[PDB]
């Protein structure tokens, strides 16, 4: 008997219209857990480097985490994997809400899509019943609009729907996949979906989902719920509110936007406004938000209610969470009202809220400098806010200049020329970064920007404090009950760490300390993305209810396989280097692992070199960022090593 996982996947060939259920190999679960882990295995030996993102041989995988569909609080994430049309590397993207559990209740762990459909279609899953439906009447509809129409047609009010908007249909490189209050946002997975002629994936499930050790599993859940209560009564002392509690960044709730609006960079990740947050601005935004926020709502089986339904006057309701609230506003140097209105359009279109506003702010910088002319923008309105609405429509339609801008800042600059490449100053591996330009080099964040396979900084940080406490008493109090740490040495590091003086950044924590910290933080994320656990209750916040010590208990009692702290650490390492191996085979080298040139104002070449050098060694990779034969064999990735030698990626 299989437990926690269903043991089955759906293989769908959109070219032939064939649908097949296939049993999975339980050994793969022991090696790569599930979710992102088992996705990586599938992509590795079925998507060779000669495969292009927009070719039929590219795969689009929808995966439910191993423990999705179990009573585990907040365990509900879908993991979408493919090859990115923007970065040309692997792209995994996480989506919360209610979709992944429904898939489990339907009886499947994954859906793997290959080939292309000549006509716009959608997939309809209802337990054992699976079929491909025509979706031509849905052409151009928004992603939310599409879900409602479909559920009426099928007469399935409790069906879960993941859809693309027009942007996906037109293969915009930063097109997303939307589901109610959830989004697979980054990497262009929406573009691959549209390229395959897939408008939506509809699922209804009503089967039972079993766990191996019933009494022990529910006990661990109660333990988590109790910790969540305690944590909400005891937030992290002396720290700004948005860092003090559990969940995704609680941007939809209260807090004064002083740090955010005065540290983030406005426009094309350009301007820093030191004294922006005035009393007039604070009340104006507070008033806009009180009027627009309808309700704080949760993902499946979670009490944290990070998301919020947003209702602007004369517009359809949509759902927003986290930093999407700020990005459109800041990119356009405008107010919160404008941001909430344009993000509504962008959500229905299905656009990544990180890349899209930077692309538009990028375009207007070129128009300002003269690299782009007014000839390129026919019918350009005069008002600033109106211009963003104008450009947004050009992009999702790939109309004129929109066709170039739809490729993202990197490829757009490369096509535009005339020194437009200088203005694409916020990319790593051709992927737009969070609009943050700090002053002093952060050794911990330097490593994360460089090596993170998600290529997004907010999805690799978490477990270690971003900043040190001034007083020692504050540090002593914090580490006292810091049970989540793998080793007692992490406490001692944070005790020594100081904001100013000899024990401050970039020289402290030491190179070796920084390598251990980044390794821990990254590990927790990869475990979450395999198990389907929301990072809001695990890898992202300080002192989470899920950690390296109780996680193996969940896996063992849930899935019914042997698991301990050490075996879990190794498992996490196994598919994390497998993902690394996939990107290596697609041409990634040490050269691509650099942050933007202007990312810090204080750089230290010799220190940065030693950081990356030491990190590679800790990871078990060589000096070019490639996993060595030795460490591959040790992880059970011998077949990886052989192919590297055969491809001349490693010397025999």
């Amino acid at each position: 008997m299989r437990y926690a996982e269903t043991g089955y996947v759906l293989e769908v060939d959109l070219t032939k219209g064939s649908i097949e259920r296939v049993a999975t190999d339980p050994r793969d679960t022991e090696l790569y857990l599930g979710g992102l882990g088992t996705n990586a295995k599938i992509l590795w030996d079925r998507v060779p480097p000669e495969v292009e993102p927009f070719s039929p041989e590219n795969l689009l995988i929808f995966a439910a985490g191993l423990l999705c569909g179990t009573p585990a609080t907040g365990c509900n994430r879908t993991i979408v994997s493919t090859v990115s049309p923007q970065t040309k590397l692997m792209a995994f993207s996480m989506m919360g809400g209610f979709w992944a559990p429904e898939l489990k209740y339907a009886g499947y762990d994954k859906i793997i899509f290959r080939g292309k459909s000549p006509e716009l279609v959608y997939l309809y899953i209802n337990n054992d019943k699976v079929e491909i439906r025509d979706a031509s009447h849905l052409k151009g509809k928004g992603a939310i609009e599409t879900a409602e129409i479909i559920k009426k047609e099928l007469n399935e009010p409790r069906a879960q729907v993941a859809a693309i908007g027009k942007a996906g249909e037109n293969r915009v490189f930063y097109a997303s996949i939307e589901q109610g209050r959830s989004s697979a946002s980054r990497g262009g997975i929406g573009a691959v979906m549209g390229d395959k002629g897939l408008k939506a994936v509809v699922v209804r499930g009503t089967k039972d989902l079993c766990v191996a050790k019933p009494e022990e599993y529910i006990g661990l859940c109660n333990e988590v719920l109790d910790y969540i209560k305690h944590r909400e009564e005891n937030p992290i002392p002396d720290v700004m509110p948005i860092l003090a509690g559990l969940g995704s960044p609680q941007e939809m709730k209260v807090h004064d936007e002083k740090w955010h609006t005065e540290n983030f960079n406005w426009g094309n990740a350009r301007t820093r406004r030191k004294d922006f947050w005035t009393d007039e601005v604070s009340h104006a935004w507070e008033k806009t938000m009180d009027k627009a926020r309808t309700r704080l709502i949760s993902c499946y089986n979670c009490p944290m209610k990070c998301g919020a339904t947003i209702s602007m006057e004369g517009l359809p309701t949509y759902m927003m969470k986290c930093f999407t609230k700020l990005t459109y506003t800041m990119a356009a140097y405008s107010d919160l009202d404008f941001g909430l209105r344009i993000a509504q359009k962008a959500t229905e279109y299905g656009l990544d809220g990180f890349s899209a506003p930077q692309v538009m702010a990028f375009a207007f910088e070129l128009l300002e400098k003269g690299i782009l002319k007014d000839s390129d923008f026919p019918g350009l309105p005069e008002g600033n806010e109106e211009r963003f609405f104008y450009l947004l429509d050009k992009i999702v339609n790939r109309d004129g200049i929109g066709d170039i801008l739809a490729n993202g800042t990197y490829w757009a600059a490369q096509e535009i020329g005339n020194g437009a490449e200088d203005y694409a100053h916020n990319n790593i591996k051709k992927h737009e970064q969070l609009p943050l330009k700090l002053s002093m080099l952060n050794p911990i964040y330097y490593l994360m920007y460089c090596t993170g396979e998600k290529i997004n900084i907010t999805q690799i940080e978490g477990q270690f404090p971003q900043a040190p406490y001034p007083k020692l008493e504050q540090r002593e109090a914090f580490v006292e009950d810091w049970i989540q740490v793998p080793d007692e040495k992490f406490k001692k590091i944070f005790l020594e760490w100081e904001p100013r003086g000899e024990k401050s950044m970039p020289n402290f924590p030491t190179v070796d300390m920084c390598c251990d910290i980044v390794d821990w933080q990254e590990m927790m994320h990869y475990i979450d993305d395999a198990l389907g656990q929301c990072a809001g209750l695990s890898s992202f916040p300080l002192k989470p209810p899920y950690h390296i010590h109780n996680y193996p208990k969940f896996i063992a009692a849930g899935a019914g396989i042997e698991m301990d702290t050490e075996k879990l650490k190794k498992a996490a390492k196994r598919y994390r280097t497998l993902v690394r191996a996939f990107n290596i085979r697609r041409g990634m080298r040490r050269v691509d692992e650099q942050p933007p040139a202007n990312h810090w104002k204080n750089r230290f070449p010799e220190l940065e070199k030693e950081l990356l050098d030491s990190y590679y060694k800790l990871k078990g990779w060589n000096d070019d960022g490639i996993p060595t034969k030795e460490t591959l064999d040790d992880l059970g990735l011998g077949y990886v090593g052989d192919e590297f030698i055969k491809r001349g990626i490693l010397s025999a």
Partner: protein
Amino acid sequence: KRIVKTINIDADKCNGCRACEVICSAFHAMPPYSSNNPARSRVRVVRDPLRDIYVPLYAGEYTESECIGRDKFIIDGKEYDECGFCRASCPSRDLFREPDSGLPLKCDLCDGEPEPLCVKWCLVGALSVTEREVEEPDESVKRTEMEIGLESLISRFGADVVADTVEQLT
């Protein structure tokens, strides 16, 4: 002087997470917690985020027949569903009926347990149960869950067909 129990549902506080559906169905698995399935939960949330509707609904009493006419409410600007407030275990829909058999479900306030689990797991505190005493006599025909279940099957498939199947299973 008997005791009646009220379930207090503050649907303004509901966030639509369905934790209540998970824990109820988990606990009622055989053996307890051996699986879960929101479709067999004895509490079922009516949820439509676009229309801001979040109503938790508790299974009630069994009816073998449908009503002659069904009801649909527009209240305070919200268009609720046909039978959208009815607690009945009814042959007109799948709510409060086992998805594989059609057997009646019924809430018993987690009889025998310390506290109702849906209430225990609703962390935002949308749900609660309170009790009071009443002079009014209790005129209920108290029927066992097995007897309601068996009779619902006998009503659907016939006394002889059910009796014979039971013989070939025991």
